[PDB]
């Protein structure tokens, strides 16, 4: 019954690790969201990931695709109150970075102040820059 490599919704996950860490790899599921889903699904977070039969994979894929309707509350979700509709959503790898990218483009359009910083690759949240954030290369004068 034992296996070495399993896959759930894109990224494939190790099989000699505990179930709660094996899911950490999926971009969009940290550690505190993994404990939750493993509990709600109905199985331990300490079982060896290789021991996952496939109907349980079907269960997990169900949960990750609309978790609010299974018990995962709407204060612990990737993004609440979607800017296009007040629904509360939890996205994962492929859909995630695109959503952030369009949330950035939206600020680039109207030419806000928080969009131009994203343009020029500078701080965004009000830091100081006389002394740190030196992502460049030294300049000389004379010797």
């Amino acid at each position: 019954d034992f296996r070495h490599i399993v896959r759930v919704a894109g990224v494939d996950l190790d099989g000699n690790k505990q179930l709660r860490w094996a899911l950490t790899a999926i971009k969009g599921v940290g550690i505190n969201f993994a404990t939750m889903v493993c509990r709600v699904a109905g199985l331990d977070p300490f079982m060896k990931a290789g021991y996952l039969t496939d109907e349980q994979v079907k269960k997990i894929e169900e949960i990750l695709q609309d978790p609010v309707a299974h018990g995962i509350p709407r204060w612990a979700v990737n993004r609440p109150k979607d800017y296009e509709t007040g629904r509360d959503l939890h996205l994962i790898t492929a859909k995630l970075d695109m959503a952030i990218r369009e949330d950035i483009m939206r600020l680039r359009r109207i030419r806000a102040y928080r969009g131009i910083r994203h343009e020029l690759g500078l701080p965004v949240r009000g830091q100081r820059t006389r002394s740190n954030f030196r992502r460049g290369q030294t300049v000389g004068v004379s010797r």
Binding site: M36, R39, V40
Partner: protein, 149 residues
């Protein structure tokens, strides 16, 4: 013997066991989704993290007398790891504790002394000392020096 006659952790472990049979103690609807205080980082790991909290709360009003909610939140706080800045002490949440005290009240082990907090009942002292004696009647085999008292 009493609860003053054994170490705290062994007694709490043994109490939390029998506690699982009182029908009033049962975990609320948001227990699997909560960490215990703004100073932690990860959720509790065992499945019965409830019964340990409640059982530590009994022994905590036995030998502390009239004690109140905002004083059981200083006890269950800790030190925080807040990034690039130094560490600092913080209190704990409220719901996990208020529910525990209301459930122990409904069980019959504590009671609301008005204006001064809560204290333990006779039923509660019987409950705790019976288990303390039950344990100690075996901690003296491997430690033959407790036999005196």
């Amino acid at each position: 013997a009493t609860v003053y006659d054994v170490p705290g952790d062994l007694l709490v472990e043994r109490v939390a066991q029998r506690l699982k049979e009182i029908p009033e103690i049962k975990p609320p609807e948001w227990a699997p989704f909560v960490k215990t205080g703004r100073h932690k980082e990860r959720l509790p790991e065992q499945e019965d993290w409830w019964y340990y909290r409640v059982a530590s709360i009994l022994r905590r009003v036995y030998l502390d007398g009239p004690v109140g909610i905002e004083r059981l939140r200083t006890y269950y706080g800790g030190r925080k790891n807040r990034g690039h800045a130094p560490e600092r002490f913080y209190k704990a949440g409220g719901s996990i504790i208020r529910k525990a005290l209301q459930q122990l009240e409904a069980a019959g082990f504590v009671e609301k002394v008005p204006g001064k907090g809560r204290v333990i009942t006779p039923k509660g002292r019987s409950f705790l000392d019976k288990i303390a004696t039950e344990l100690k009647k075996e901690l003296e085999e491997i430690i033959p020096e407790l036999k005196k008292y």
